[PDB]
Design an enzyme around this catalytic site. Structure first.
Site, mmCIF file in Angstrom:
data_model
loop_
_atom_site.group_PDB
_atom_site.id
_atom_site.type_symbol
_atom_site.label_atom_id
_atom_site.label_comp_id
_atom_site.label_asym_id
_atom_site.label_seq_id
_atom_site.Cartn_x
_atom_site.Cartn_y
_atom_site.Cartn_z
ATOM 1 N N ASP E 44 84.570 3.762 81.004
ATOM 2 C CA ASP E 44 84.142 3.369 82.209
ATOM 3 C C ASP E 44 83.351 4.115 83.304
ATOM 4 O O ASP E 44 83.035 5.329 82.969
ATOM 5 C CB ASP E 44 85.353 2.716 83.020
ATOM 6 C CG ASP E 44 86.280 3.846 83.687
ATOM 7 O OD1 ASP E 44 86.100 4.860 83.478
ATOM 8 O OD2 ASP E 44 87.104 3.414 84.588
HETATM 9 C C1 LIG Z 1 91.319 11.476 101.015
HETATM 10 C C2 LIG Z 1 91.167 10.111 100.215
HETATM 11 C C3 LIG Z 1 90.380 9.216 101.195
HETATM 12 C C4 LIG Z 1 90.558 7.713 100.488
HETATM 13 C C5 LIG Z 1 89.774 7.547 99.636
HETATM 14 C C6 LIG Z 1 89.705 6.175 98.897
HETATM 15 C C7 LIG Z 1 90.948 5.602 98.521
HETATM 16 C C8 LIG Z 1 90.876 4.189 98.519
HETATM 17 C C9 LIG Z 1 90.811 3.877 96.897
HETATM 18 C C10 LIG Z 1 91.398 2.275 97.026
HETATM 19 C C11 LIG Z 1 90.250 1.162 97.156
HETATM 20 C C12 LIG Z 1 89.388 1.107 95.560
HETATM 21 O O1 LIG Z 1 89.891 1.645 94.693
HETATM 22 S S1 LIG Z 1 87.608 0.216 95.583
HETATM 23 C C13 LIG Z 1 88.080 -1.319 94.413
HETATM 24 C C14 LIG Z 1 87.359 -1.036 93.243
HETATM 25 N N1 LIG Z 1 87.515 -2.191 92.193
HETATM 26 C C15 LIG Z 1 86.907 -3.463 92.337
HETATM 27 O O2 LIG Z 1 86.101 -3.477 93.289
HETATM 28 C C16 LIG Z 1 87.322 -4.565 91.412
HETATM 29 C C17 LIG Z 1 86.427 -4.440 90.114
HETATM 30 N N2 LIG Z 1 85.145 -4.503 90.329
HETATM 31 C C18 LIG Z 1 84.054 -4.065 89.407
HETATM 32 O O3 LIG Z 1 83.041 -4.544 89.663
HETATM 33 C C19 LIG Z 1 84.401 -3.081 88.554
HETATM 34 O O4 LIG Z 1 85.277 -3.318 87.480
HETATM 35 C C20 LIG Z 1 84.499 -1.721 89.009
HETATM 36 C C21 LIG Z 1 85.923 -1.039 88.585
HETATM 37 C C22 LIG Z 1 84.066 -1.471 90.349
HETATM 38 C C23 LIG Z 1 83.529 -0.619 88.208
HETATM 39 O O5 LIG Z 1 83.939 -0.439 86.986
HETATM 40 P P1 LIG Z 1 82.725 -0.299 85.768
HETATM 41 O O6 LIG Z 1 81.241 -0.122 86.237
HETATM 42 O O7 LIG Z 1 83.207 0.784 85.023
HETATM 43 O O8 LIG Z 1 82.747 -1.680 85.102
#
Ligand SMILES: CCCCCCCCCCCC(=O)SCCNC(=O)CCNC(=O)[C@H](O)C(C)(C)COP(=O)(O)O
Lengths: 117, 108, 55, 546, 88, 443, 157, 64, 125, 58
Positions: E44
């Site tokens: 990924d």
């Molecule tokens: C010190 C720490 C400070 C805070 C740091 C931040 C911590 C918060 C993190 C939590 C918020 C999130 O995860 S952010 C949310 C991320 N997930 C999504 O948006 C839904 C999935 N959408 C997609 O387009 C793809 O699956 C994707 C997985 C994005 C790409 O993977 P690939 O391209 O392989 O396919």
């Protein structure tokens, strides 16, 4: 919040750079790489709880909240390799750019090396 | 690669030499047009003055204000030096006739 | 100019250049009213400086 | 033997910077510098022995007068007292090992000989400053060591950060120097002479002490003037070591001790505040060099408090300087060796294990850390405890705050020093570089530093060490327990959740940012306003077109 | 030595392959020169970022963000390394 | 007098030389300026510090033209006669030789004048010479010459009625009788203040110099920097204090505040300059203001301190101009952003730039340091506030100095190679003189 | 640098149709970088067709009065009306032309010919009598055969 | 451009407008600088004020 | 290990700002302003408002003990008098204004001794 | 409309004209997160995410 260039990144690229810079900061706040390992595992897991998100409004909410969290946590003293940009060993002693040499300039056109008036 | 000299000195101008002769102009820079425009503007910045709000405010509060401050400070220093040498009031420019130039023959 | 100058002279009970300064400033202001605005300060300055030089 | 202590490093530096150096090379330049340093060191040792132990002060007519116009008389004259002898001995002993280390650290630098010559100039001008009998020669030494520091910091003229740091330090020191010059004007106008022996004061007009202390604080990087010191790490390791051990930083305290014309309240307040700020600064970073620089600042604050206490406090402060220089240089050199073994890595987070460096460097760092943190029966132990006891009995209610602040500062000192050693060796390895350099000369320099540290204990600096002052048993043991507490906390290597305090502390309290826009950008704006608005504007006289 | 500040092709390829196999999902026999990350290796975007950081550690490099974004396959990374005079 | 006339006629022989034999042309032009240097050396060997405050007195009948020597005039003559051969070494045309010969003659004649009308006549006889010098067709600026000539003429025209009024008041124009007669000190004092505040760069009427000294070539630049400002200081010392003291006293707050604001604004304005030559131009203003305040202080040793500072600037600043001229001629531009990596490119030249920069910044082992120490001693004895104001802003000049030096010297190497034998020789007298006067100026 | 054709005057040849005040067309060859009036003198126009410039440090410059058709108006180099040079030009309008002014009245000294000027056609504009000094004047009558090109010098004095 | 793929290109642009400081802030900080760095002036002037106040009280009480 | 390749600074290609004399271009990338923090980002993205707000309390928190001890407690806090010296010896030592022996409240002229110890700034005529 | 002296005075009251042509900018290293921060207390400093990713792990 990220910068305007990061704002222009694709959603995939935006989240990728977010995660990368978060790992960078966790190293920056880490006492050691050994301390950084479990933090790295937890950080990887936290994104794993958001893999199957579809509603773009909540996706944008999570992304914006994470960006604000990261921006609040910009490390004052980043860990840099010495010979890269911002590193202490950068720009110490470079190779001399080629510079032409003028031999015996005083010898040329004597008695006429002053100033016109 | 030219020969602007003879094997025994004797600088040759080399007017008809194919090669480019090394000269006083050899190490001249190649001017940057934006840099030239900027330097002309800064050397001819006089055309940019105007009695706007900001310029007038700055000129009065800083230039004339600190002129007045330094003037008053000089007056204070002069009067205090007079008082620290046992002298009466002295006549500055426009201060009514008074004592000037204490005599070397008088103990004050 | 004359009226204001003699007015200040009588008001202050003494003679100096300040009365001429007031007269010059007033004359410049009256001359300078209603014109663009590097003028309403400059003209009183010109008149007052002229009065000072005259004295 | 007397004038050998000053003129010899100067002649060596002149030769090293003369066109003669073209005909010698780096091998010959190193030989000449080491020989000059050793000869001057021998002369200084002889002078120290004779002056300290047999009490023989000698005054020298060197070049006649410098300039005598009006009642103002300035002469190239040198006098060697206990103070001058101590300063010369300390500076020469430090700089000899500094030159020894620099002869090996920069072996692959192109222009090594210029570096050696500038180091020799720095040492010689320090000797000139300490040799001064009158204030003008003190000023000459002040500005000469300033110029040498400017050249040495800007050695690598290809890095803009070093140039900015050098200019900033030069300007801050120039502010301090203007204050010092105003003080000198006052001193001559109200005392009629410049020789320190002809300066005996009981109650001045206050401005004397205030201006002199401000000028000294400028060189000593005290509160409101410490910002430059951290940025000086841009320069090579030998420059930082020499500057932070026995020169430049010491000059202000040396002048204050020589003068003893200060005001106790302001001295104590400034010293305590600076020490507390340095202590909180040193434990909150991750650059190895900056921590040691802040430790230097903290010890400077300690000396400031001691000299503010009194004449006995002043002598104790001088002894504190004498003991501090050796292990400060030792810490700098050990840090440089470890950094070089770490492929130029200057960050703590990529260290660990006992494979990257030699055993001797590790042991030297251990000994220096132990001495600096006041480990019982050690070099820094005696001076720090003497200053603490003399500060636990002061007649000023103000000093009570200072005593508590210095206790906290010492505890934090032990904290970050133990953290330094822990991150250097005790933690697991977390970098990518292992090139343990085991060259003879830097090891011998460390050996000389450690031998001098041993001498400072086996032989006391003054008669103060061993003079027992009558305190409750808990009070004497208090700094020992504080060091133990720092040891425990650092070996725990634990941190807090209050991250806003962390981000505040790491920023060095934003002082650089504050001075970036309160005086500086307004200076720029005042300049533009003056030039454009006045000259090309208000003061402009245009053309009468026709 | 060799190279105007650059290393050989072969040790770079070997190091990249050795780094590559550090995943549970990865079968060793399918890693080869110029291999697709997503389509072939099935890693990924998080895995690609982790691999970029790991290669940065292995070669001691601070890769710019845009160039890292360009990295999407084994061959691209190898050729990028084969352009670096700053890689150890 | 006879010797002086012999030199005057001998210098004029340059035009009579046919242009065919260029070698002898250069030899003659240089030797004509060489001779007065030895003559002034002979004078200094002839002077007696145990003698009268004036020595070698001579008067040309009822034609005014009273010539006498003090320490200030002799030292200024020595410095000028050292400067001029370097300027000659930088010229290639007979016209330049003639102009600079006439300028040197006028400067020398005015330096030892003792007649106020004589000073008036002799001083501004070079204004047309400066006008022709500055606004040269290929590279000069007509506007700068227009400016400076108008400023000087305005000053002289203001002064002249005062000069003739005191002449009629005392029946003569000799200083030693002008100093002994009762007079209306105020009007003559305003005239003297106006002229010597135009000549010495003092705010507000000082704006001609930044354009003039930059538009002029290297030789004229050095002349203007090191000579004509000191004509103002010697003007004060020789005329204003000996003649009209009460005006000097009643104007002291005005003079002091004007000098202080001049120094402050010039120092602050310099940082915003973007050309090395303009930076050097603003640098001299602070020195002249310091000299003027030292003169006006009159506390303990004001004349000697002022003379020391004048000598120090006339020594150091021409070196800055020499470096600027070398860089421009071998670079064809004066714009800062085209200067970088000069140390690796011009090692000895950059070292000289550093040394003379420190010289401008009043550092020990240099005459400027002792000069400013003495000037601040004189200022302090009058009051401590003025001395503090001078002391506080010491950092602000060194700021721009170090910034410009580091910006142009360190960094990426690009531009000319190091200096030539002629250039090092031109630099040499200033270095040797500065070292000699910063180690053992006296004995 | 290759087979680039040899430099010939044809590549810089400019032709302008000029018609006198008597209504006679005349063919004139011009060159790039030079003023129109210089070529006009080079053609053989009578001295009466010219006049001194009324500016400072430019009184040695000759000029002729011509009319510019509407198309070529934009090829005339701009001059500031507020400038001292502009003041000299306005003095030239005030004195030389008087009620001969036309909205196409222009001065050839400000015409630098180029590629676009090829084929451009202008005519001579009438002028009032004038006098500068003893050796160069205008009676108001265009009855002469002396060529302005035949004057050895331009004496402003 | 041969090193952009190693140490970054010139794509990112500095976000600075090159504008003079805020008038009120500039004025306030100028006054702060003047006060901090010209304290001897105020000290001397306040000394003179206290001295003349002492003289005024002496004059008031001594003539009664 | 000298000789590391370094990126250069490409020459500008658009009209310069009026006040461009604050960007330090040494010819190598990256350049810097005239001074750090003067414009652009700050490490940690903190602002001057943040630090002003923090200092508005931190300064008084540090200063408070100074005022309290200087205004509510005197030399009687110490359980001993300063080091004693004979009259002919002490009489010169206490003359110094900085001398700490003035704080002997057992001194025969204690209040007088403290009276002489005040600090003046302008020398009186 | 009296023609007066001031009509010949070139009053310095004309606003200077700037151009809409793009100005030059020196390139600078990118900062991913450069939002200006202004608060001493921010609930982000007690965000459970930060606890989970920094403090909670062993
Ligand atoms: C010190 C720490 C400070 C805070 C740091 C931040 C911590 C918060 C993190 C939590 C918020 C999130 O995860 S952010 C949310 C991320 N997930 C999504 O948006 C839904 C999935 N959408 C997609 O387009 C793809 O699956 C994707 C997985 C994005 C790409 O993977 P690939 O391209 O392989 O396919």
């Amino acid at each position: 919040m990220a910068s305007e260039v990061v704002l222009a990144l694709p959603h995939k690229l935006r989240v990728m750079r977010m995660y990368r810079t978060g790992l960078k900061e966790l190293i920056n706040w880490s006492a050691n790489r050994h301390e950084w390992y479990p933090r790295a595992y937890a950080l990887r897991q936290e994104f794993e709880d958001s893999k199957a998100l579809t509603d773009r409004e909540e996706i944008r909410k999570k992304l914006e909240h994470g960006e604000e969290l990261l921006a609040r946590f910009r490390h004052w003293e980043p860990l840099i390799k010495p010979e890269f940009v911002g590193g202490t060993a950068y720009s110490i002693n470079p190779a001399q750019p080629k510079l032409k040499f003028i031999p015996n300039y005083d010898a040329m056109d004597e008695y006429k090396k002053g100033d016109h008036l | 690669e030219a020969k602007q000299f003879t094997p025994d000195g004797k600088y040759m101008p080399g007017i008809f030499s194919k090669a480019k002769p090394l000269d006083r102009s050899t190490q001249w820079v190649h001017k940057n047009p934006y840099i030239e425009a900027w330097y002309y503007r800064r050397d001819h910045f006089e055309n940019e003055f105007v009695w706007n709000y900001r310029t007038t405010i700055e000129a009065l509060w800083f230039l004339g204000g600190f002129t007045a401050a330094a003037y008053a400070l000089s007056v204070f220093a002069f009067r205090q030096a007079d008082r620290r040498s046992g002298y009466p009031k002295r006549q500055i420019l426009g201060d009514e006739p008074a004592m000037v130039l204490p005599d070397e023959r008088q103990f004050y | 100019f004359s009226f204001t100058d003699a007015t200040v002279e009588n008001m202050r009970g003494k003679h100096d250049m300040t009365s001429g300064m007031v007269a010059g400033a007033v004359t410049g202001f009256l001359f300078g009213m209603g014109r663009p605005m590097p003028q309403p300060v400059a003209w009183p300055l010109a008149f007052a400086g002229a009065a000072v030089a005259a004295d | 033997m007397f004038l050998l202590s000053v003129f010899f490093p100067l002649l060596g530096g002149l030769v090293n910077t003369s066109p003669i150096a073209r005909f010698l090379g780096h091998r010959g330049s190193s030989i000449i510098a080491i020989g000059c340093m050793v000869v001057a060191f021998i002369s200084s040792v002889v002078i120290y022995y004779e002056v300290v132990f047999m009490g023989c002060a000698v005054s020298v007519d060197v070049f006649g007068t410098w300039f005598s116009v009006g009642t103002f008389h300035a002469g190239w004259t040198f006098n060697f007292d206990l103070l001058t002898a101590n300063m010369l001995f300390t500076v020469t002993g430090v700089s000899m090992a500094v030159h020894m280390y620099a002869c090996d650290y920069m072996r692959q630098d192109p222009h090594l000989n210029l570096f050696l010559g500038y180091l020799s100039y720095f040492t010689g001008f320090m000797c000139v400053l300490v040799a001064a009998d009158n204030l003008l020669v003190m000023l000459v030494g002040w500005e000469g060591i300033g110029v040498c520091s400017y050249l040495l910091i800007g050695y690598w003229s290809h890095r803009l950060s070093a140039v900015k740091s050098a200019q900033k330090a030069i300007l801050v020191n120039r502010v301090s120097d203007g204050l010092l010059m105003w003080g000198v004007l006052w001193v001559w106008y109200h005392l009629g002479s410049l020789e320190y022996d002809l300066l005996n004061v009981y109650s001045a007009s206050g401005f004397v002490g205030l201006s002199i202390l401000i000028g000294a604080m400028g060189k000593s990087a005290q509160i409101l003037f410490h910002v430059w010191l951290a940025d000086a790490m841009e320069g090579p390791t030998p420059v930082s070591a020499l500057i932070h051990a026995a020169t430049l930083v010491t000059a202000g305290v040396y002048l204050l001790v020589r003068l003893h014309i200060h005001d106790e309240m302001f001295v104590i307040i400034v010293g305590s505040l600076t020490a507390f700020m340095a202590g909180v600064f040193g434990a909150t970073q991750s650059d190895l060099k900056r921590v040691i620089a802040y430790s230097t600042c903290s010890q400077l604050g300690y000396m400031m408090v001691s000299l503010g206490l009194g004449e006995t406090g002043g002598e104790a402060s001088m002894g504190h300087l004498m003991t501090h220089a050796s292990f400060k240089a030792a810490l700098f050199l050990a840090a440089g060796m470890v950094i070089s073994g770490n492929g130029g890595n200057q960050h703590i987070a990529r260290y660990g294990g006992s494979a990257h460096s030699a055993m001797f460097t590790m042991l030297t760092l251990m000994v220096a850390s132990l001495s600096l943190i006041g480990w019982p029966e050690l070099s820094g132990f005696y001076s720090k405890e003497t200053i603490l006891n003399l500060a636990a009995i002061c007649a000023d209610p103000i000093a009570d705050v200072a005593h508590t602040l210095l206790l906290l500062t010492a505890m934090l000192t032990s904290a970050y020093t133990t953290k330094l050693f822990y991150q250097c060796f005790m933690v697991d390895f977390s970098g990518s570089s292992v090139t343990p350099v085991r060259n003879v000369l830097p090891i011998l320099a460390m050996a000389i530093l450690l031998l001098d540290i041993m001498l400072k204990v086996w032989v006391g600096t003054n008669l103060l060490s061993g003079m027992l002052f009558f305190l409750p048993w808990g009070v004497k043991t208090l700094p020992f327990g504080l060091m133990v507490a720092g040891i425990l906390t650092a070996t725990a290597a634990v941190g807090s959740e209050r991250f806003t305090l962390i981000r505040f502390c790491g920023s060095r309290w934003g002082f650089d940012q504050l001075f970036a826009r309160s005086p500086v950008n307004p200076i720029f704006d005042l300049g533009r306003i003056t030039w454009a608005i006045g000259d090309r504007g208000l003061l402009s006289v245009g053309n009468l077109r026709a | 030595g060799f190279g105007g500040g650059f290393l050989d092709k072969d040790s770079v390829t070997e190091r990249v392959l050795h780094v590559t196999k550090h995943f549970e999902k990865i079968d060793a026999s399918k890693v080869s020169p110029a291999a697709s990350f997503e389509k072939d290796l099935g890693l990924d975007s998080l895995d690609v970022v982790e691999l970029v950081m790991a290669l940065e550690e292995e070669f001691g490099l601070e890769i710019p963000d845009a160039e890292a974004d360009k990295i999407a396959s084994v061959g691209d990374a190898i050729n990028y390394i084969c352009s670096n005079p700053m890689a150890k | 007098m006879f010797i002086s006339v012999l030199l005057i006629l001998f210098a004029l022989c340059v035009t009579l030389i046919p242009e065919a034999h260029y070698h002898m042309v250069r030899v003659w032009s240089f030797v004509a300026t060489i001779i007065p240097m030895w003559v002034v050396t002979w004078m200094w060997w002839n002077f007696d510090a145990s003698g009268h405050g004036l020595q070698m007195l001579v008067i040309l009948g009822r034609s005014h033209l009273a010539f006498g020597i003090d320490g200030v005039a002799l030292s200024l003559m020595l410095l000028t006669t050292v400067l001029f051969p370097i300027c000659m070494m930088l010229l290639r045309t007979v016209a330049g030789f003639m102009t600079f010969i006439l300028l040197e003659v006028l400067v020398l004649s005015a330096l030892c004048v003792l007649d106020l009308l004589g000073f008036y006549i002799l001083f501004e006889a070079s204004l047309i010479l400066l006008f022709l010098l500055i606004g040269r067709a290929p590279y000069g600026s007509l506007e700068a010459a227009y400016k400076i000539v108008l400023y000087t003429m305005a000053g002289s025209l203001v002064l002249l009625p005062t000069l003739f009024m005191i002449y009629s008041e005392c029946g003569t124009t000799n200083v030693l009788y002008m100093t002994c007669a009762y007079n209306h000190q105020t009007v003559l004092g305003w005239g003297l203040l106006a002229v010597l505040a135009v000549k010495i760069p003092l705010m507000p009427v000082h704006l001609w110099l930044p354009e003039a000294h930059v538009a002029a070539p290297t030789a004229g630049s050095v002349l203007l920097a090191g000579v004509l400002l000191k004509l103002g200081g010697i003007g004060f010392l020789r005329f204003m204090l000996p003649v009209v003291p009460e005006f000097c006293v009643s104007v002291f707050p005005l003079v002091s505040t004007l000098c202080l604001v001049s120094f402050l604004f010039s120092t602050l304005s310099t940082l915003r300059q973007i050309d090395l030559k303009k930076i050097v131009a603003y640098s001299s203003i602070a020195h002249m203001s310091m000299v003027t305040l030292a003169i006006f202080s009159q506390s303990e040793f004001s004349a000697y301190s002022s003379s020391f500072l004048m000598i120090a600037h006339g020594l150091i600043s021409p070196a800055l101009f020499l470096i600027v001229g070398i860089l421009y001629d071998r670079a064809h531009t004066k714009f800062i952003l085209y200067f970088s990596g000069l140390g690796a490119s011009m090692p000895i030249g950059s070292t000289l730039f550093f040394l003379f920069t420190l010289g401008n910044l009043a550092f020990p082992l240099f005459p400027n340091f002792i000069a400013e120490v003495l000037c601040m001693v004189s200022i302090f004895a009058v009051h401590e506030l003025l001395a503090y104001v001078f002391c506080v802003c010491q950092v602000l000049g060194a700021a721009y100095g170090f910034w410009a030096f580091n910006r142009v010297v360190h960094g990426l190497p690009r531009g000319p190679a190091d200096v030539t034998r002629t250039e090092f020789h031109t630099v040499l007298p200033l270095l040797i003189g500065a070292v000699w006067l910063g180690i053992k100026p006296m004995a | 640098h290759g087979p680039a054709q040899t430099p010939t005057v044809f590549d810089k040849l400019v032709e302008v149709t000029v018609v006198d005040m008597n209504g006679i067309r005349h063919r004139v060859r011009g060159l790039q970088g030079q003023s129109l009036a210089q070529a006009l003198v080079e053609y053989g126009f009578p001295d009466t067709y010219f006049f001194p410039n009324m500016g400072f440090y430019t009184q040695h410059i000759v000029d002729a009065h011509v009319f510019v058709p509407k198309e070529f108006w934009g090829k005339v180099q701009n001059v500031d009306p507020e400038s001292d040079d502009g003041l000299a030009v306005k003095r030239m309008f005030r004195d030389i032309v008087q009620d001969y002014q036309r909205d196409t009245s222009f001065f050839a000294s400000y015409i630098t010919l180029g590629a676009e000027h090829n084929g451009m056609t202008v005519g001579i504009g009438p002028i009032k009598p004038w006098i500068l000094h003893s050796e160069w004047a205008f009676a108001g009558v265009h009855d002469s055969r002396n060529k302005q090109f035949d004057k050895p010098t331009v004496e402003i004095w | 451009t041969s090193l952009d793929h190693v140490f970054g290109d010139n794509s990112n642009k500095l976000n600075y407008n090159f504008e003079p400081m805020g008038m009120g802030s500039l004025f306030i900080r100028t006054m702060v600088m003047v006060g901090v760095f010209f304290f001897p002036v105020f000290i001397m002037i306040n000394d003179d004020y206290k001295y003349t106040s002492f003289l005024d009280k002496v004059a008031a009480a001594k003539a009664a | 290990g000298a000789g590391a390749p370094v990126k250069l600074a490409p020459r500008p290609d658009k009209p310069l700002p009026t006040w461009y004399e604050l960007w330090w271009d040494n010819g190598y990338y990256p350049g810097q302003p005239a001074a750090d923090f003067m414009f652009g980002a700050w490490p940690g993205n903190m602002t001057e408002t943040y630090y002003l707000r923090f200092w508005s309390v931190f300064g008084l928190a540090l200063a408070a003990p100074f005022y309290y001890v200087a205004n509510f407690t005197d030399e009687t806090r110490m359980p001993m008098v300063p080091q004693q010296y004979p009259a002919e010896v002490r009489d010169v030592l206490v003359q110094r204004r900085n001398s700490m022996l003035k704080h002997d409240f057992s001194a025969p002229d204690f209040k007088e001794v403290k009276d002489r110890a005040k600090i003046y700034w302008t020398p009186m005529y | 409309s009296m023609k007066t002296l001031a009509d010949y005075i070139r009053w310095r009251n004309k606003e200077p004209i700037k151009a809409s042509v793009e100005e030059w900018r020196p390139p600078v290293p990118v900062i991913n997160y450069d939002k200006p921060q202004n608060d001493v207390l921010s609930a982000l400093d007690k965000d459970p995410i930060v606890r989970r990713v920094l403090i909670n792990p062993k």
